[PDB]
């Protein structure tokens, strides 16, 4: 599994949530921006690692950062279809 971290610079775009193809991200209420909402990654075990969330993030440097961990890959982080690891 990868590591998807959300930083304080988030401005509640919701673009990262919409771009995620495996429903890793979600919007949670907060009080650090005018949108009163920040992103969260409660399900990074389903994060394939496509980094579309990073493409969609418009902050100066990404408020959402995906750290690839190749020696950590699970069946969900690899998108295995022909083969089951469970």
């Amino acid at each position: 599994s990868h590591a998807v971290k959300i930083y304080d610079t988030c401005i509640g775009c919701t673009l990262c949530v919409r771009a995620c193809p495996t429903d890793v991200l979600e919007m949670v209420p907060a009080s650090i921006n005018a949108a009163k909402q920040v992103a969260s990654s409660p399900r990074v075990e389903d994060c394939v690692g496509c980094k579309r969330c990073e493409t969609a993030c418009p902050t100066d440097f990404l408020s959402i950062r995906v750290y690839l961990q190749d020696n950590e890959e699970t069946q969900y982080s690899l998108g295995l279809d022909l083969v089951d690891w469970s």
Binding site: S1, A3, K5, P42, V44, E45, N71, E72
Partner: protein, 119 residues
């Protein structure tokens, strides 16, 4: 004759370039299916857990993984920090040093080293 060393070659060359390599490949593919396979680079192996716990049992390396290890008298450090924060506390602020540090130590990263659950 200049030959007569080929008596050694006719045994050694077939041996070390066919029998030994084949045995090595078979032993390697057998080793690949052990629970201990590549325990130093592959996460979540039993031997890695045992080695980490063995290190933690040593009296020198008990509090070795703690990034804050070193404070000889942590009570003195905490008291000094609390005193310094009291003189700089903004107006009627209700945050103390103790709970501030307690909540700054507790983060929410459930998916960190979750591979410590199989072996």
């Amino acid at each position: 004759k200049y030959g007569d060393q080929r008596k050694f070659a006719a045994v050694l060359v077939p041996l070390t370039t066919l029998v030994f390599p084949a045995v090595a490949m078979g032993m390697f593919v057998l080793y690949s299916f052990q629970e201990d396979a590549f325990w130093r680079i592959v996460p979540g192996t039993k031997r890695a857990r045992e080695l980490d716990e063995a290190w933690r049992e040593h009296p020198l390396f008990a509090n070795s993984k703690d990034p804050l290890d070193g404070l000889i008298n942590p009570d003195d450090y905490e008291k000094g920090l609390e005193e310094a924060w009291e003189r700089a506390k903004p107006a009627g602020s209700t945050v103390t040093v103790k709970d501030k540090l307690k909540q700054l130590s507790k983060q929410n990263n459930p998916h960190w080293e979750s591979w410590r659950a199989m072996s």
